[PDB]
Design a protein around this ligand. Structure first.
Ligand code: NAP
Ligand code: SND
Lengths: 362, 174, 366
């Protein structure tokens, strides 16, 4: 049985669905692993390293999928009309696994359904506690929260930590993070490391506890693992005490998300207008609309003295760490169905880890 | 000409106070005693005592030297004060726990007009009831001058390492 | 009397020699403070924010300097030979205070001498305990050490701290800091709080202790214990081969920066690595660095931003305005509002470059 990992061809993507460590494990399971030459250059994972791990190197992407029984990718294949038929490379009848992005990418789903291709959308993984090791949203969110503080510190013209000096005291940056989920918790941690006083808030009440344990203060207000819309009534009661802290904030990171619905606006243009000049806003929900209407995907926007950052595919900004983890999420999702000496795959299906994910098993 | 003193003693002196302010210095850094030191403070302010840190702009070997190490030990910001915002409080303080700090207290900066440390602002540690130091020996610090505060009526010389000399005090503090 | 703060003209200089907190002091000391419009913008110090402190807002640099008795700048004023005569704007016989770069820029000093301007070069402050608050060399370098780490983090494709996740573990980043002065020390502290394994190396023996006082690990050969020891660079290369981010802070006044990481050495580095050369304006500690840009060779990113202190302009400027004020106050007394620099003062004698129509500092052909 063969498995192939191509180089990511989408604009920006520097991640790759593989690492040396993950090839070793794949090999021991009876898989012949072919990786595309130069595929791990953006993640610092060299060709030399993958071979030593037991895999093989393919000259072209086309050669990589040519005889692939299973294909692993980070981002969804570019459909024929997207500028280069990748779905057309993946050998017919094989299995694909990646952040296909089901829901919003209906076409790519049929192009695969026509090539008699079985694809698994890793971003639809159930929120069950035994799947944390295979959840790509989490492994990437986590890094995104780190990179947010980094990107914030970069764009910020002041230093993060307090330092009492012979020339006077440089006060600590004051950070406020809207949305204390995975990305937000890590944003709090990394921020607390550089010495900033951290402020946070979330609708989910089970948060306040976590925030206080990391070292931050909780801005109190007032599903099966997440939340939904709160109503105009709340949003207004929210910007209440938030104000008190938002007009004293230097870095504001927004990570709020709500499935199937537009990202919740938490900082209006009327609020950014009140932030200290030189402040920075890191909008992580930018690709779901954004938590601040001023943010625009892929670029930094300065408006009213505040810098509003909205990079896209932030996880790729942390490629070398993001990739190993991504490759492992896939390994953890596949490994449980490789019947030990037979070299053949069968997706349980009774196991919701295969059902909640399989979009087209044509 | 110099009074001595051990942990047990230092535990006593401080354990019998209502207001205590810590004064960290390079010494506290070389020994990496921030976590020990921060303990001797929360076990101290446990009784109900008030604690404060007197941070002198030029403590350690670089700007914010004391800050980063205190911040790592998790000592609160609103409890750490700069020379100018606390230099007065020493008077109404029984103990002036001087861990690893020396030049930051030497009085030769207001007197002895010819001292390398002359003109430089210092912390009013002496105005504190009892001033407990801490240091491996007698050698001076960066300055290269002796501290007249070392040998005089109200002054302790807990000779040793900052992390250890603090480690024990925390113990004989139970 | 009258003191004015112009906007910095040199390209990329975002700092400004003033602050709201400092104006209140200058007024309280007797001065009438004037500052060019848009002067503190790059430093997030608005005119309104400034006026509110007691400052007036002249509209152009000329109008700001015109009749000022004391002038404050960060970088040295430009001459006619550079395309813009700023020393021409300064009133004759006035007093200038700024980072002159005197010992290395005789032309500006001459320009100032022709207009009988008393100039105090802040960079020449005496290294004495009482002038620590008047030292711009350390307040700026300190922020640069901080920023060197932030830029390195920004350019690195991995996170600094080790993370243990449900999906796996990612090791911390390894930082190696070359040169342990004020800058390098703050870099160690910033890299260590961010969670990286930090190694350092400097020529001055007494360093090892400073480095450990920050959780760093000093690079020392262990052929034994504390004829040609020039093979210590084998221990330095041992680490470099495992380093993710190398930050070099070595510099020497007047002289070119000493090469600390050869091209030969960078080839031995792992792909994805970044070298932050804070010594890039004096030639660099790495010959592959280029003033003002991120070059890339052998898979290694060689970052060489200029004027790093300016990359932390909003905190750097108030610190600088502070140094300036701390230097001046001891000379502004009753005398019905008049400053007089006691020639006895070592702070004045070691910093004064030229006095009313005549070069004064020894090291300057006079
Ligand atoms: N802040 C800056 O950026 C900077 C830069 C350059 C110079 N300086 C100067 O350095 C001085 C710093 O203030 P400071 O109060 O800390 O002065 P020091 O630096 O003068 O004092 C050092 C104290 O720590 C002790 N010490 C060393 N290792 C120790 C250990 N392992 N355990 C316990 N104690 C230890 C020393 O004595 P023993 O060896 O006898 O134990 C000494 O009493 C000032 O004079 C300042 O101007 C500061
Ligand atoms: N495999 C399993 S079991 C799994 C996987 C991923 C996350 N989780 C859990 O789900 C929770 C969060 O996950 P997530 O991925 O970060 O969610 P997601 O990134 O979608 O949510 C971001 C944050 O937005 C918050 N939020 C949404 N709307 C608002 C609003 N109007 N005001 C304030 N905050 C708002 C929300 O509560 C959450 O904390 C955590 O407590 C995790 O533990 C479980």
């Amino acid at each position: 049985m063969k498995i192939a990992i191509p180089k990511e061809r989408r604009p920006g993507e520097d991640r790759v669905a593989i690492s040396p460590e993950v090839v070793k494990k794949l090999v021991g399971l009876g898989f012949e692993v072919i990786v595309e030459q130069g595929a791990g250059v953006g993640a610092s994972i060299t060709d030399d390293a993958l071979t030593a791990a037991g895999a093989t190197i393919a000259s072209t992407a086309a050669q990589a999928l040519s005889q692939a029984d299973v294909v692993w990718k980070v981002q969804r294949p570019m459909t024929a009309e997207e500028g280069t038929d990748e779905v057309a490379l993946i050998k017919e009848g094989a299995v694909l696994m990646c952040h296909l992005g089901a829901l919003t990418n209906r076409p790519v789903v049929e192009a695969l359904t026509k090539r008699k291709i079985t694809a698994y959308a890793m971003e639809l993984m159930p929120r069950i506690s035994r799947a944390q090791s295979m959840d790509i949203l989490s492994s990437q969110s986590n890094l995104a929260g780190y990179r947010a503080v980094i990107d914030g510190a970069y764009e910020f013209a002041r230093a993060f930590p307090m330092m009492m000096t012979a020339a006077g005291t440089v006060p600590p940056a004051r950070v406020l993070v809207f949305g204390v989920g995975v990305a937000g918790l890590q944003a709090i941690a990394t921020a607390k490391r550089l010495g900033a006083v951290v402020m946070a808030t979330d609708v989910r009440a089970a948060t306040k506890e976590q925030v206080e344990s990391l070292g931050g203060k909780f801005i109190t207000v007032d599903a099966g693992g997440y939340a939904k819309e709160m109503g105009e009534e709340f949003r207004k009661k929210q910007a209440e005490a938030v104000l008190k802290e938002l007009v004293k904030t230097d870095i504001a990171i927004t990570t709020a998300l709500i499935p199937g619905k537009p990202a919740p606006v938490l900082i209006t243009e009327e609020m950014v207008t009140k932030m200290k000049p030189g402040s920075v806003i890191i909008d992580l929900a930018v690709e779901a609309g954004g938590n601040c209407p001023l943010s625009e995907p892929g670029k930094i926007v300065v408006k009213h003295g505040v810098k509003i950052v909205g990079h896209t595919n932030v996880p790729s900004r942390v490629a070398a760490d993001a990739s190993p983890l991504f490759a492992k999420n896939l390994l953890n999702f596949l490994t449980p169905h490789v019947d030990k000496d037979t070299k053949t795959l069968v997706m349980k299906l009774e196991d919701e880890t295969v059902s909640g994910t399989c979009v087209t098993r044509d | 000409s110099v009074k001595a003193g051990s942990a047990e003693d230092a535990a006593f002196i401080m354990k019998n106070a209502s207001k205590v302010i810590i004064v960290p210095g390079y010494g506290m850094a070389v020994a990496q005693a921030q976590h020990a030191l921060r303990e001797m403070a929360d076990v101290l302010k446990k009784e109900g005592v008030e604690v404060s840190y007197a941070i002198h702009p030029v403590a350690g070997r670089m700007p914010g030297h004391m800050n980063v190490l205190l911040a790592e030990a998790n000592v609160p910001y609103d409890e750490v004060f700069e020379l100018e915002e606390i230099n007065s409080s020493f008077q109404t303080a029984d103990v002036a726990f001087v861990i690893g700090a020396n030049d930051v207290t030497n009085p030769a900066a207001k007197t002895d007009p010819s001292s390398p440390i002359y003109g430089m602002p210092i912390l009013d540690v002496e105005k504190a009831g009892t001033v407990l130091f801490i240091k491996r020996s007698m050698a001076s610090g960066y300055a290269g001058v002796e501290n007249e505060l070392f040998f005089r009526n109200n002054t302790m010389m807990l000779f040793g390492d900052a992390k250890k000399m603090t480690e024990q005090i925390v113990q004989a503090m139970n």
